[PDB]
Amino acid sequence: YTKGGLRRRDLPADPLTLFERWLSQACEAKLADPTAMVVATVDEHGQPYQRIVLLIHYDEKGMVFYTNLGSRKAHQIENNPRVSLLFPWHTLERQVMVIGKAERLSTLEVSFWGGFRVSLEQIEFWQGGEHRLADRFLYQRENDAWKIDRLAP
């Protein structure tokens, strides 16, 4: 039901190890759409725009979702590929955020149906803790390694 503590001693070398654990625990607890994430894109004037897409696939190169290539988000990524993704796992007192560049997948990802992979430049993990004081760890990709920091909730 409830899972308690996120300490720097429990952290895996690969942030995706933590993601995968959390992702599967979300499916285990039958959350609606455990693969659902909110994509933030930015338009030509600096306006952020948001919508929910599904995580189809992930690995160390990126996180993958599909969308229409004529869609509003598709156009925005063309002008500016900087995006954020967030998994709203607040039902289990959790967030996960990914900062990266969205890059169109190739045609052979198997007309106007398309796919994007967001690089892993940052991955933040948020988990709700004792005395309503959350555990926050940010992985920042640097020099083919991850710099990890506790952040104040």
Next chain:
Amino acid sequence: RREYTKGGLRRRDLPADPLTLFERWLSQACEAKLADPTAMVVATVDEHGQPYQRIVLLIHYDEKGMVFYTNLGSRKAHQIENNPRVSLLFPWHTLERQVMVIGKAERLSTLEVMKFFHSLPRDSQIGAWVSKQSSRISARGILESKFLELKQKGEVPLPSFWGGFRVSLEQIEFWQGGEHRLADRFLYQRENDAWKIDRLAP
């Protein structure tokens, strides 16, 4: 929960004021026992055109805008002072819904902040003092040590780093999706002291 999910959504079910429909949806989400009906994902953009996201709680709303409280030294506050253009998303996908709001984030006045702050319980009031939000911390003891410390506090004073923001209602999108249907998708766009209302393709 499918009592609400089942029906389509069309112009003829839309009120002229979009907060009427938002309030309806919010209420249903509370009635449907959703985890945190008032939680919304706030999107900001840094100096480099890179968007950042995080969940916050909707505290108040009316025609002036939607309001949340945050730490004023946090990453989002700084991002907002450089670029006030934000987005809010209410991730109501258990009910196959999304409401997104576009507008501008302006700081609440001190006196606004004082009112809400006073309505909270003493726990959350002390809570506001603890964490230098978003800043790099050596370890969890630093917070816990300070949280325990602040139990020597009695009328609770207001931190100068604790306030909030009102996001204006420039655009509001409603999204009523479903299983195997095309999504019903409506944009309220503020113009000339009125709402231009359009169905968007899913």
